[PDB]
Scaffold this active site. Sequence first.
Site, PDB file in Angstrom:
ATOM      1  N   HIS A   1      12.745  74.366  22.999  1.00 48.93           N
ATOM      2  CA  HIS A   1      14.095  74.856  23.259  1.00 48.93           C
ATOM      3  C   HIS A   1      14.419  76.082  22.435  1.00 48.93           C
ATOM      4  O   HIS A   1      15.504  76.637  22.649  1.00 48.93           O
ATOM      5  CB  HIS A   1      15.127  73.750  23.130  1.00 48.93           C
ATOM      6  CG  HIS A   1      15.413  73.331  21.753  1.00 48.93           C
ATOM      7  ND1 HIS A   1      14.810  72.289  21.106  1.00 48.93           N
ATOM      8  CD2 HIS A   1      16.318  73.834  20.866  1.00 48.93           C
ATOM      9  CE1 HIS A   1      15.344  72.191  19.876  1.00 48.93           C
ATOM     10  NE2 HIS A   1      16.249  73.112  19.722  1.00 48.93           N
TER      11      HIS A   1
ATOM     12  N   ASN B   1      16.072  84.254   0.939  1.00 49.14           N
ATOM     13  CA  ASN B   1      17.364  84.725   1.409  1.00 49.14           C
ATOM     14  C   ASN B   1      17.179  85.516   2.719  1.00 49.14           C
ATOM     15  O   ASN B   1      16.615  86.600   2.727  1.00 49.14           O
ATOM     16  CB  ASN B   1      18.020  85.620   0.346  1.00 49.14           C
ATOM     17  CG  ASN B   1      19.451  85.911   0.647  1.00 49.14           C
ATOM     18  OD1 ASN B   1      19.823  86.124   1.820  1.00 49.14           O
ATOM     19  ND2 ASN B   1      20.289  85.999  -0.393  1.00 49.14           N
TER      20      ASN B   1
ATOM     21  N   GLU C   1       8.749  89.128   2.204  1.00 44.84           N
ATOM     22  CA  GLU C   1       8.787  88.993   3.650  1.00 44.84           C
ATOM     23  C   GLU C   1       7.725  89.682   4.369  1.00 44.84           C
ATOM     24  O   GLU C   1       7.298  90.798   4.011  1.00 44.84           O
ATOM     25  CB  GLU C   1      10.099  89.640   4.194  1.00 44.84           C
ATOM     26  CG  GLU C   1      11.419  89.098   3.670  1.00 44.84           C
ATOM     27  CD  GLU C   1      11.973  89.770   2.417  1.00 44.84           C
ATOM     28  OE1 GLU C   1      11.236  90.610   1.774  1.00 44.84           O
ATOM     29  OE2 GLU C   1      13.111  89.413   2.108  1.00 44.84           O
TER      30      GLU C   1
ATOM     31  N   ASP D   1       9.008  68.698  23.409  1.00 43.63           N
ATOM     32  CA  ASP D   1       9.712  69.830  22.818  1.00 43.63           C
ATOM     33  C   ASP D   1       8.859  70.529  21.775  1.00 43.63           C
ATOM     34  O   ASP D   1       9.101  70.415  20.545  1.00 43.63           O
ATOM     35  CB  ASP D   1      11.086  69.360  22.278  1.00 43.63           C
ATOM     36  CG  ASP D   1      12.027  70.463  21.929  1.00 43.63           C
ATOM     37  OD1 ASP D   1      11.778  71.626  22.298  1.00 43.63           O
ATOM     38  OD2 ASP D   1      13.055  70.179  21.245  1.00 43.63           O
TER      39      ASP D   1
ATOM     40  N   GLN E   1      22.210  72.259  13.327  1.00 45.01           N
ATOM     41  CA  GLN E   1      22.068  73.501  14.094  1.00 45.01           C
ATOM     42  C   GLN E   1      21.581  74.614  13.205  1.00 45.01           C
ATOM     43  O   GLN E   1      22.116  74.852  12.118  1.00 45.01           O
ATOM     44  CB  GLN E   1      23.337  73.899  14.831  1.00 45.01           C
ATOM     45  CG  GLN E   1      23.592  73.111  16.158  1.00 45.01           C
ATOM     46  CD  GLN E   1      23.854  71.633  15.980  1.00 45.01           C
ATOM     47  OE1 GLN E   1      24.523  71.210  15.056  1.00 45.01           O
ATOM     48  NE2 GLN E   1      23.233  70.809  16.741  1.00 45.01           N
ATOM     49  N   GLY E   2      20.565  75.317  13.708  1.00 54.38           N
ATOM     50  CA  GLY E   2      19.836  76.341  12.988  1.00 54.38           C
ATOM     51  C   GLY E   2      18.553  75.878  12.363  1.00 54.38           C
ATOM     52  O   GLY E   2      17.763  76.723  11.941  1.00 54.38           O
TER      53      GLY E   2
ATOM     54  N   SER F   1      16.417  73.737  14.119  1.00 51.44           N
ATOM     55  CA  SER F   1      15.486  73.498  15.213  1.00 51.44           C
ATOM     56  C   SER F   1      14.232  74.258  15.072  1.00 51.44           C
ATOM     57  O   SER F   1      14.237  75.453  14.758  1.00 51.44           O
ATOM     58  CB  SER F   1      16.030  73.862  16.579  1.00 51.44           C
ATOM     59  OG  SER F   1      16.826  72.778  17.117  1.00 51.44           O
ATOM     60  N   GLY F   2      13.093  73.637  15.406  1.00 53.09           N
ATOM     61  CA  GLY F   2      11.804  74.276  15.393  1.00 53.09           C
ATOM     62  C   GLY F   2      11.123  74.188  14.071  1.00 53.09           C
ATOM     63  O   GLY F   2       9.904  74.422  13.986  1.00 53.09           O
TER      64      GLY F   2
HETATM   65 CA   LIG Z   1      14.791  88.028   2.838  1.00 51.28          CA
END
Ligand SMILES: [Ca+2]
Lengths: 223, 13
Positions: A40, A54, A62, A84, A174-175, A177-178
């Site tokens: 989803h 962050n 990153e 799923d 929520q947020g 997921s996955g």
């Molecule tokens: Ca960052």
Amino acid sequence: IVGGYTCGANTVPYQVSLNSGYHFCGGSLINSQWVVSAAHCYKSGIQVRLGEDNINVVEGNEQFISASKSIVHPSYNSNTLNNDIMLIKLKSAASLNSRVASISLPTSCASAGTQCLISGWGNTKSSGTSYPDVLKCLKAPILSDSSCKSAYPGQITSNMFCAGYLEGGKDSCQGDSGGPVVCSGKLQGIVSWGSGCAQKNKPGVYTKVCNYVSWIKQTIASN
Amino acid sequence: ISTRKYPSDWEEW
Ligand SMILES: [Ca+2]
């Protein structure tokens, strides 16, 4: 994550953020070129963000890599949420380091009572909304199949399991997921669904990754 | 209303 704690920067090095001009889902890095997430969470244009703490500040660990392929399980059903799972191929290989690292797939399914680590950048409130900048973590046990079915009558397939706390107060949201459910160093689950978040008698429901290991390997080998 | 995507699953329909 409701009722969790600040993980600490790069302490969950397999956690990724899926970004479509904003964070919308998590995922788990399983090799230098492939991520596991929820079906989803499919979108046509995904940027995978590895090494994040962050998500609103460039801090220097990153790696931002576009998805080249996002492959939903062919038997995914958006009504029942069965199957799923999605595989994301990165356009280029991530550089693996102490802050960006893969998580192993399971060799067997986990039992009830096994403690797992669940992580993400999802909502931290059970009522209303409060989204974190930094990654959150929760330790939560896998529940018995009978407890899981009793919480969600008629809804739990053999490709799902429940984890968390029946008293409420601690859950994914929520947020998230996955994102990963890791138990004894293996990826056992994918954040999928629940009724509200952190509510009494309504634990989180997670895709059962051990059912898909062969499918994952074959999909990767042929793509 | 059940899936855990941000902001929600239904919001994307
Ligand atoms: Ca960052």
